[PDB]
Paper text:
Discovered in three individuals from a family in Sweden, this mutation gives rise to a dominantly inherited form of early onset fAD. Post mortem analysis of Uppsala APP brain tissue is consistent with typical AD pathology, showing abundant deposition of extracellular Aβ plaques, primarily composed of AβUpp(1–42)Δ19–24 or an N-terminally truncated form, alongside intracellular tau tangles. To summarize, we solved the fibril structures underlying the tau and Aβ pathologies in a transgenic mouse model and a patient carrying the Uppsala APP mutation, the first known multi-codon deletion mutation in the APP gene leading to AD.
Tg-UppSwe transgenic mice express human APP with the Swedish APP mutation (KM670/671NL) and the Uppsala APP mutation (Δ690-695) and their brain pathology therefore consists solely of mutant AβUpp(1–42)Δ19–24. The ordered core of the fibril, for which atomic model building was possible, extends from residues S8 to A42 (Δ19–24). A hydrogen bond between the carbonyl group at H13 and Q15 in the same monomeric subunit stabilizes the N-terminal arm of the S-fold. The interface between the two protofilaments is formed by salt bridges between K28 and A42' of the adjacent protofilament. Interestingly, murine AβUpp(1–42)Δ19–24 fibrils show a high similarity to human and murine wild-type Aβ42 type II filaments, although the sequence register in the N-terminal domain is shifted by six residues.
Numbering used by the authors:
A (entry chain J), B (entry chain H), C (entry chain F), D (entry chain D), E (entry chain B), F (entry chain I), ...: 14 to 42
Write the structure that this text describes.
């Protein structure tokens, strides 16, 4: 038991939000 | 128990928000 | 128990916010 | 228990905010 | 218990803000 | 007869293409 | 006959392409 | 007959391309 | 017959490319 | 017949490229 995020690959253009793990807070994309 | 984020690869152009781990706060992309 | 972020690689152009770990505060990308 | 950020590599052009760990404050990218 | 940021490498051109650890204040990139 | 574009006002954040008049060429937004 | 662009006002943050008149060429936003 | 661009006002932060008139070439924003 | 760009006003901050008239070449913002 | 750029005013902080007229070459901002 726990939370984890691993081994991913992203390529190209970002203009929004990219987030690995979110435990709280607010994201206006 | 815990939170972690590892071994990821990102390539190219960013104009937004990229975040590994978010525990609180606000992100206007 | 804890929070951690490791071994990631980023390549190219940034004009936004890149953040390893966020525990609070505000990010206007 | 604690917060940490390690072993990451960044390459290329920055015009925004790059932050290892954020515990508070404000970031206008 | 504590906060730390280590073993990262950054290469290329900066015109914004690069910050290891932020505990308060304001960053206009 | 002719082409013209006038008296417009834009306010806020741009991350795409804003073009007054386009007679040819290519725009990847 | 002709092409023209006038009297416009833009305010705030730009991270993309802003172009008055485009007669040819390529724009990667 | 001709091409012209006049009387515009721009205010704030630029991190992209701002161009009055473009007759050819390439713009990577 | 011709190309011209006049009477414009820019205020604030720049980290990209600002160009009055472009007849050729390449811009990497 | 010709190309010209006149009567503009620029105020504030520059860290990129400001160009009146470009007839060729390359601009890495």
């Amino acid at each position: 038991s726990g939370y984890e995020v691993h081994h991913q690959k992203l390529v190209g253009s970002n203009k929004g939000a990219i987030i690995g793990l979110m435990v709280g807070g607010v994201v206006i994309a």
